[PDB]
From Swiss-Prot:
It comes from the Bacteria. Coiled coil: none annotated. It comes from Streptococcus pneumoniae serotype 4 (strain ATCC BAA-334 / TIGR4). This is Beta-N-acetylhexosaminidase. Belongs to the glycosyl hydrolase 20 family. It is found in: Secreted, Cell wall. Residues 1-434 are annotated as: Catalytic domain 1.
Length: 434
């Protein structure tokens, strides 16, 4: 029961790339069928593809009008990638989506990313007239990352997160603030190093109090998310980067989506350290990643064959960078991304990824009872015209379905399937009294 109690989550990048309500419902249907508990839907990730009915934002001593914010965001998103399939989900569509998923026992966890991966929000702030929102590193300007020194850009971004969190209140449980990959473009994937650099290498032009400002920013977003009764979540790479606790402390109520163990010259906190500091961990191991369009071996990083290998070889309990410690988890999340958002979305390939993750960790995933429910609905209601012996067999086969444990795992699907087959056989064997 400890395994079944974990969250099993599929993540979809509907920030970079448009997904229709119809497509998202299909993903939810497959998630339910395969025994998942949640859909993790990025809506702000480079692109911003979710618009509230009221997008008025109060910051900087004024209100930015809802119509202008909407227009700024649509335009800013299109400047990132003008997706021929669509620009954004509406509030009505999101409310209906969350309700659709709720009726299937599927939760929804949104991401609206900052202070990185916010190309569209930066664009929108400029369309509104906010000056110089982008972070720059020695003359290289980031297209994705806000400058934490810019009070007006920061205040707007926070108010925008607040506006979305207010919407998601009471209809969801977790809100992912992201926080990954600060200034990845401008610093060539060294942004955390850069933010910490001035403390250790002063008078060299590194951002003064860079990392300390990032901690404060992260903590203020956590405060804002918690005020709405939501649990804040964030990706791990910037949290105690280089295992450095000397800049300040992150809010313990931030759940960590642990997606990377780091790489050469990019030294992240271990999951051991983060657990010790008091953070819950959602295992989001990039072993399982799939980037749309990279569909076979040789087609680049996080290609589908690599992700299926990752799922085969790295179980849901294997967290990045454990330092050999036993790391508890709240669950696991398999993620599909749209780094090249003009790539064709292939449902069957995403479903294969999701199915493989479910099958490789089958004791964790819920079983599927829907066919069992259907079979019970197909039993003839009135059995009086059949022989007592044939009737008893049917009643016994029905009782046996109703007596199945109601929280079986996917590993035990055969038990359900056998019970269905027995019922069908007994119904087929109903014999009319002569
Ligand atoms: C949390 C997360 O998964 N973030 C991104 C991550 O990014 C890639 C890649 O885009 C970066 O260039 C490198 C160096 O920082 O890191 C990762 O390899 O993985 C996903 C798949 O590429 C992205 O879609 C995520 O946005
Ligand atoms: Mn107007
Ligand atoms: Mn641009
Ligand atoms: Mn159901
Ligand atoms: Mn500065
Ligand atoms: Mn180090
Ligand atoms: Mn292959
Ligand atoms: Mn049902
Ligand atoms: Mn049904
Ligand atoms: Mn039980």
């Amino acid at each position: 029961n400890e395994k079944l109690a974990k969250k099993k989550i599929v993540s979809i990048d509907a920030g970079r790339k448009y997904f229709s309500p119809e497509q998202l419902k299909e993903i939810i249907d497959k998630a339910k069928h395969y025994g998942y508990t949640d859909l993790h839907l990025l809506v702000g990730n480079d692109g911003l593809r979710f618009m509230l009915d009221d997008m008025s934002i109060t910051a900087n001593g004024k209100t930015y009008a809802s119509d202008d914010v909407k227009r700024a965001i649509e335009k800013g998103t299109n400047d990132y990638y003008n997706d021929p399939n669509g620009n954004h989900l509406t509030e009505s569509q999101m409310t209906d989506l969350i309700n659709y998923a709720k009726d299937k026992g599927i939760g929804l966890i949104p991401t609206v990313n900052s202070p990185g991966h916010m190309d569209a929000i930066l664009n929108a702030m400029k369309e509104l007239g906010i000056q110089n929102p982008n972070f720059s590193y020695f003359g290289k300007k980031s297209a994705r990352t806000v400058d934490l020194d810019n009070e007006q850009a920061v205040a707007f971004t926070k108010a925008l997160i607040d506006k979305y969190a207010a919407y998601f209140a009471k209809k969801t449980e977790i809100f992912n603030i992201g926080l990954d990959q600060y200034a990845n473009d401008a610093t060539d994937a060294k942004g955390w190093s850069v933010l910490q650099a001035d403390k250790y290498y002063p008078n060299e032009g590194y951002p003064v109090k860079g990392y300390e400002k990032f901690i404060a920013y992260a903590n203020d977003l956590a405060r804002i998310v918690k005020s709405h009764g939501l649990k804040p979540m964030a990706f791990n790479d910037g949290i105690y980067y280089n295992s450095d606790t000397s800049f300040g402390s992150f809010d313990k109520d931030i759940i960590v989506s642990m997606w990377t163990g780091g790489w050469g010259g990019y030294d992240v906190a271990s999951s051991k350290l983060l657990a010790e500091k008091g953070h819950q961990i959602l295992n989001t191991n990039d072993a399982w990643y799939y980037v749309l369009g990279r569909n076979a071996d040789g087609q680049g990083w996080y290609n589908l064959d690599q992700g299926l290998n990752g799922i085969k070889n790295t179980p849901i309990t294997s967290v990045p960078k454990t330092e050999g410690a036993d790391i508890p988890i709240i669950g696991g999340m398999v993620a599909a991304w749209a780094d090249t958002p003009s790539a064709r979305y292939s449902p069957s390939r995403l479903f294969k990824l999701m199915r493989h993750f479910a099958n490789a960790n089958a004791e964790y995933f819920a079983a599927d009872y829907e066919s069992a429910e259907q079979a019970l609905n197909e039993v003839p209601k009135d059995l009086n015209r059949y022989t007592a012996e044939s009737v008893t067999a049917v009643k016994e086969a029905e009782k046996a379905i109703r007596s199945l444990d109601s929280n079986l795992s996917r590993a035990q699907q055969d038990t359900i399937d056998q019970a269905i087959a027995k019922l069908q056989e007994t119904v087929n064997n109903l014999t009319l009294t002569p």
